[PDB]
Motif scaffolding. Structure first.
Motif, PDB file in Angstrom:
ATOM      1  N   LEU A 271       0.821  -1.293   0.036  1.00  0.00           N
ATOM      2  CA  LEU A 271      -0.004   0.081  -0.023  1.00  0.00           C
ATOM      3  C   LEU A 271       0.830   1.247  -0.063  1.00  0.00           C
ATOM      4  CD1 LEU A 271      -2.625  -0.994   2.429  1.00  0.00           C
ATOM      5  CD2 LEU A 271      -3.064  -0.665   0.020  1.00  0.00           C
TER       6      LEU A 271
ATOM      7  N   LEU B 196       2.627   4.422  -3.354  1.00  0.00           N
ATOM      8  CA  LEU B 196       2.497   5.813  -3.248  1.00  0.00           C
ATOM      9  C   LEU B 196       3.717   6.326  -4.162  1.00  0.00           C
ATOM     10  CD1 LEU B 196       1.559   6.385   0.263  1.00  0.00           C
ATOM     11  CD2 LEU B 196       0.080   6.941  -1.838  1.00  0.00           C
TER      12      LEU B 196
ATOM     13  N   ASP C  61       9.052  13.093   0.873  1.00  0.00           N
ATOM     14  CA  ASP C  61       8.214  13.942   1.403  1.00  0.00           C
ATOM     15  C   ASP C  61       6.580  13.201   1.673  1.00  0.00           C
ATOM     16  OD1 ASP C  61       9.350  16.180   1.723  1.00  0.00           O
ATOM     17  OD2 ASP C  61       8.885  17.120   0.016  1.00  0.00           O
ATOM     18  N   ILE C  62       6.473  12.324   0.469  1.00  0.00           N
ATOM     19  CA  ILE C  62       5.138  11.550   0.790  1.00  0.00           C
ATOM     20  C   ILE C  62       5.251  10.678   1.830  1.00  0.00           C
ATOM     21  CG2 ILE C  62       3.671   9.908  -0.409  1.00  0.00           C
ATOM     22  CD1 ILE C  62       4.660  11.266  -3.157  1.00  0.00           C
TER      23      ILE C  62
END
Ligand SMILES: [K+]
Ligand SMILES: [K+]
Ligand SMILES: [K+]
Ligand SMILES: [K+]
Ligand SMILES: [K+]
Ligand SMILES: [K+]
Ligand SMILES: [K+]
Ligand SMILES: [Mg+2]
Ligand SMILES: [Mg+2]
Ligand SMILES: [Mg+2]
Ligand SMILES: [Mg+2]
Ligand SMILES: [Mg+2]
Ligand SMILES: [Mg+2]
Ligand SMILES: [Mg+2]
Ligand SMILES: [Mg+2]
Ligand SMILES: [Mg+2]
Ligand SMILES: [Mg+2]
Ligand SMILES: [Mg+2]
Ligand SMILES: [Mg+2]
Ligand SMILES: [Mg+2]
Ligand SMILES: [Mg+2]
Ligand SMILES: [Mg+2]
Ligand SMILES: [Mg+2]
Ligand SMILES: [Mg+2]
Ligand SMILES: [Mg+2]
Ligand SMILES: [Mg+2]
Ligand SMILES: [Mg+2]
Ligand SMILES: [Mg+2]
Ligand SMILES: [Mg+2]
Ligand SMILES: [Mg+2]
Ligand SMILES: [Mg+2]
Ligand SMILES: [Mg+2]
Ligand SMILES: [Mg+2]
Ligand SMILES: [Mg+2]
Ligand SMILES: [Mg+2]
Lengths: 103, 48, 110, 56, 117, 142
Positions: C19, C23, C34-35
């Motif tokens: 999951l 991203l 950053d994510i």
RNA sequence: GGGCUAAACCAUGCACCGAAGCUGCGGCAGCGACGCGCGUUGUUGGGUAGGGGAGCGUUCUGUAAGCCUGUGAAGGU
RNA sequence: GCGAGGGGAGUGAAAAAGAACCUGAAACCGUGUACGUACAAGCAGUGGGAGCACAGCUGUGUGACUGCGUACCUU
């Protein structure tokens, strides 16, 4: 110009320079074969229909190759009856090249 | 006449039955015993 | 060309880690970091350390420049499961699988 | 109640087609410290909207 | 003389699974299911070598009908007319001419009409 | 040589306009279904739509024999329990006259995706006017 | 099923469609004749229980102190 | 994190021989690419078959649309 003829229990519509796959013929490779029973000859708007054969119509062809076709699998199976059978098959052919059509 | 060129007489060495090895053998599944009953069983059969 | 880091035998099921990996797949490494910083998942902590390791590998071992790097490949594989026993009612016992994962991150300027 | 047939890997994937996470749309930048931060949250160094609001 | 079965068993299972390529789900992955699927595909293929000769004749007849009715005669009268005129061209060829040489097909229709008149 | 097959990207379709005034419903429908499928063309191919576009005018003037005008019933179910509904031919002509011809033709077309695609080439109108002059339809006396 | 006033029913007729039936073309096998294993010919070849016939492959013994193999064996793909 | 784990370096014939270590099948789970798939009804194939991609008209992959088609064993 194309013509229709019978060979191997089947019929074929051919033009000069085409290669046709027929049922096996008992003719050596490189020899020429005559098909003297021509069902129809059409050259543009002139159309000769055999009744059954065109008079004097002949198709010249050259035997190009003999061979066996793609293998086919025969499967027989009777469900719940303890019966199954398999068999392979390759059909013989003769390739001929049309060299001439004459009315 | 060598140890790898001797052959038995024709008809002298019949192969034995092998039961229970598939449909094609002709003796698969029930192995010639038919279906059910005393004679199909292991050790089954009536006396002389 | 490309530089790799892995975390093998990480304590998390691959389904959970995937999951997070999804991203950042394909992003510039500065955006990827950053994510991950603002993803509230345990797996984001795991993946961020692998990505940081891959970036360091590329600089130290391969002489790459960080501003050029992208996450060109990332995937999660199933590791071995640890088998445990969980007592249930009426004397019955269940197996518990504690699943693990292998995390792979690949960075490259191309 | 329990399944009569094992569901396929295809159906498993279809159910999970709504499970993907969403990244934060964008971070904000503090006008004084220049730190990135979640919008309407303080920065890691304790700034909010340009003011040092908390020590450490 | 103990005989281990692994090498021969693997070859047999692999031969079936190779014939099951392209099938859906367990049908291309799981031996038990793939074996049934390979057998059923063989049964269908035997059946459909016979069906193929039916379906193509049915197609040739439909096209001859359309071309004959463009020339003002039904299929059934056209075939009877050709037979009375001693024309032995078969439906595979008649359908080919109907599509590729509409002028020759018209000539055949005229031959059939004359034998019927 | 292999048998010809029509190709969906090169099939030639033409536009026709038919007047349903006074025609027998079922005997008009068979000719429509035949031409929507392409059975009148030498290039007919069962898996390809080789048919024509047909405009049908004056759908509310279609005819039926016997006592069908009052006694032919059209049934349908809404999917709700007890939801069996019906309308006579005359009731259908009064309310939704294009449906009479559309229903008849749909029943004589193949079932499945291709048959649904053939039906989209049929354009039925109640009155004597259509808006497809740009397609230059040719008069067809069915 | 659509629909049908015939696309229903009766009578007469001629066409056509229609099966793995029959024929055509090519191929394989069983049995029998007839001649010299071969030729020719006729004919047969749906099958459960079950009977009969003929084979494939696997491990091991001899042939083998041979033969293949680091210029790449077995196994895997 | 004076972690776990990993990337280099080095040893070695070989490190996808690194100790969770010869070979490393299958079920099962992923990443990448090609094609298909959001108006479409059922043992999921088979016969026919367009289009696209690929390699040299053909071979390979995919398979819109369409005829036919209700698994296997046992009893
Ligand atoms: K017996
Ligand atoms: K014989
Ligand atoms: K090794
Ligand atoms: K392994
Ligand atoms: K199909
Ligand atoms: K059973
Ligand atoms: K029973
Ligand atoms: Mg038997
Ligand atoms: Mg008994
Ligand atoms: Mg039993
Ligand atoms: Mg009994
Ligand atoms: Mg006992
Ligand atoms: Mg207790
Ligand atoms: Mg059940
Ligand atoms: Mg969910
Ligand atoms: Mg041993
Ligand atoms: Mg097996
Ligand atoms: Mg698999
Ligand atoms: Mg596979
Ligand atoms: Mg149907
Ligand atoms: Mg037949
Ligand atoms: Mg027969
Ligand atoms: Mg014969
Ligand atoms: Mg028979
Ligand atoms: Mg038999
Ligand atoms: Mg030995
Ligand atoms: Mg050995
Ligand atoms: Mg270490
Ligand atoms: Mg060794
Ligand atoms: Mg190993
Ligand atoms: Mg594997
Ligand atoms: Mg709809
Ligand atoms: Mg669609
Ligand atoms: Mg469904
Ligand atoms: Mg069906």
């Amino acid at each position: 110009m194309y013509a229709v003829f019978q060979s191997g229990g089947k019929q074929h519509r051919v033009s000069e320079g085409q290669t046709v796959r027929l049922e096996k013929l008992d003719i050596a490779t490189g020899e020429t074969v005559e098909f003297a029973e021509v069902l129809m000859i059409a050259n543009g708007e002139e159309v000769k229909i055999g009744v059954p054969f065109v008079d004097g119509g002949v198709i010249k062809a050259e035997v190009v190759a003999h061979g066996r076709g793609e293998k086919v699998k025969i499967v027989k199976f009777r469900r719940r009856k303890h019966y199954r059978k398999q068999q392979g098959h390759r059909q013989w052919f003769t390739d001929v090249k049309i060299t001439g059509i004459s009315a | 006449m060598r140890l790898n060129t001797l052959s038995p007489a024709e008809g002298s060495k019949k192969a034995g039955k092998r039961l229970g090895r598939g449909i094609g053998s002709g003796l698969g599944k029930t192995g010639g015993r038919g279906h059910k009953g005393q004679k199909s069983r292991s050790g089954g059969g009536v006396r002389r | 060309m490309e530089t790799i880091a892995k975390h093998r035998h990480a304590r998390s099921s691959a389904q959970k880690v995937r999951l997070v990996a999804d991203l950042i797949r394909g992003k510039k490494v500065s955006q990827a970091l950053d994510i991950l910083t603002y993803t509230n998942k345990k797996a984001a902590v795991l993946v961020k350390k692998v990505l940081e390791s891959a970036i360091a590998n590329a600089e130290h071992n391969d002489g790459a420049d960080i501003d050029d790097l992208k996450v060109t490949k990332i995937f999660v594989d199933e590791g071995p499961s640890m088998k445990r026993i969980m007592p249930r009612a009426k004397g019955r016992a269940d197996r518990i699988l504690k699943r693990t994962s292998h995390i792979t991150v690949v960075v490259s300027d191309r | 109640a329990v399944q009569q047939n094992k569901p396929t890997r295809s159906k498993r994937g279809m159910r999970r087609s709504h499970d993907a996470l969403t990244a934060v749309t964008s971070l904000s930048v503090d006008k004084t410290s220049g730190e990135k931060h979640l919008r309407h949250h303080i920065t890691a160094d304790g700034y909010y909207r340009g003011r040092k609001v908390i020590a450490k | 003389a103990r005989v281990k079965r692994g090498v021969i068993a693997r070859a047999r299972h692999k031969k079936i699974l190779k014939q099951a390529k392209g099938y859906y789900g367990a049908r291309s992955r799981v031996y038990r299911v793939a074996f049934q699927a390979v057998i059923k595909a063989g049964q269908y293929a035997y059946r459909d070598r016979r069906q193929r000769k039916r379906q193509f004749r049915q197609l040739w007849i439909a096209r001859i009908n359309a071309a004959a009715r463009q020339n003002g005669i039904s299929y059934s009268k056209f075939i009877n007319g050709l037979k009375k005129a001693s024309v032995e061209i078969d439906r595979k060829i008649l359908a080919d001419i109907a599509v590729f040489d509409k002028v020759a097909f018209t000539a055949l229709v005229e031959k059939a009409k004359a034998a019927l008149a | 040589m292999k048998t010809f097959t029509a190709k969906p990207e090169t099939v030639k379709r033409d536009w026709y306009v038919v007047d349903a005034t006074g025609k027998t419903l079922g005997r008009l429908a068979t000719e429509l279904a035949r031409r929507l499928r392409g059975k009148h063309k030498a290039e007919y191919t069962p898996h390809v739509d080789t048919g024509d576009y047909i405009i049908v005018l004056n759908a509310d003037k279609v005819a039926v024999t016997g006592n069908k005008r009052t006694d032919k019933v059209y049934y349908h179910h809404t999917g709700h329990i007890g939801g069996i509904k019906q309308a006579t031919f005359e009731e259908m002509i009064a309310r939704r006259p294009e449906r009479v011809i559309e229903i008849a033709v749909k029943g004589m077309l193949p079932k499945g995706p291709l048959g649904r695609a053939m039906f989209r080439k049929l354009k039925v109108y109640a009155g004597n006017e259509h808006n497809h002059a740009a397609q230059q339809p040719q008069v067809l006396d069915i």
